[PDB]
Amino acid sequence: CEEPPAPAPPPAKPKAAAAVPVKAAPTETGAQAAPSYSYVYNPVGKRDPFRSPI
Amino acid sequence: IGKKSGLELSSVTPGKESVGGGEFFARIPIKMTVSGNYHEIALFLQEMANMRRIVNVNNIKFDSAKLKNEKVVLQSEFQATTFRFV
Amino acid sequence: IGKKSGLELSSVTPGKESVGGGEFFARIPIKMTVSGNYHEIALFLQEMANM
Amino acid sequence: VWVKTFSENNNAVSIDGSAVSHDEVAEFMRGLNGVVWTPKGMGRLVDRRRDSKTARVEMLTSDATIEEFPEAQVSPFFKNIDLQTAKQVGGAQVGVPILVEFKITMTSNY
């Protein structure tokens, strides 16, 4: 068996913890967006039609 | 966001990834096709442009879906894309 | 407040946040669409203004 | 902003234009009116638009005769019937416009 921990080299973790870690990452990452928002904008004017045609 | 804007989502169609649309990213475009009122489609657009994901809406169109034009109704087709990796 | 005022709520439509409507606040507008009597819509308004 | 064509009849103006996006056409359309239009009448000017016989820009939907119910309103002076159409024209390798071509018809006051 292996004991409370195992023996001292530690043993053998060069297989366990080398075919592990992992690769962790770990991915402290890919969460939720606020996204972002565009702006609205460019108008105003003058005198023209719809003068004459109304 | 379509449903809470009141629009009938008549078709959502994914795209092809743009293999020559970037060296470091394949863009997948999604063409969305929703019908309703002008206020509601402006709404749908602004909500998708306020989302927390990468749905960059670009080329927009819409028109009056009723042949005879007997009631107000606007079919709308918006193009919006997200950018996967290569 | 719409229901207790007797109005049919034909549509409630949220808005977009006003990204340039404030440095310290995003305003979300909500457009509400209710039908009934003049007394009842005055009522609905005054109740929302007393919330 | 600039627009394309303007054609009136002393009761309504059928206009033809273009705007920058889903925004400035929204600003412009808000500045007027918004309407639930219902029983439309077909008339020989529509077909003269289908005929190309009255010069215009046939990206446009047709028409200019109907009956209008107000949805929303900003100018007390103008009854816009609806944003009759809108299509974002991209252009080509010879050049852009990229913007949203559109068409509106509106009866003013009085």
UniProtKB/TrEMBL annotation, chain A:
Residues 1-32 are annotated as: Disordered. Residues 14-26 have a biased composition (Low complexity). This is PilP. The lineage of its organism: Bacteria, Pseudomonadati, Myxococcota, Myxococcia, Myxococcales. The chain holds residues 5 to 58 of 172 of the full protein. It comes from Myxococcus xanthus (strain DK1622). It comes from the Bacteria. Residues 4-13 have a biased composition (Pro residues).
UniProtKB/TrEMBL annotation, chain C:
It comes from the Bacteria. This is PilO. It comes from Myxococcus xanthus (strain DK1622). The gene is pilO.
Automatic annotation (TrEMBL), chain D:
It comes from the Bacteria. Signal peptide: none annotated. Coiled coil: none annotated. This is PilN. It comes from Myxococcus xanthus (strain DK1622). The chain holds residues 114 to 223 of 225 of the full protein.
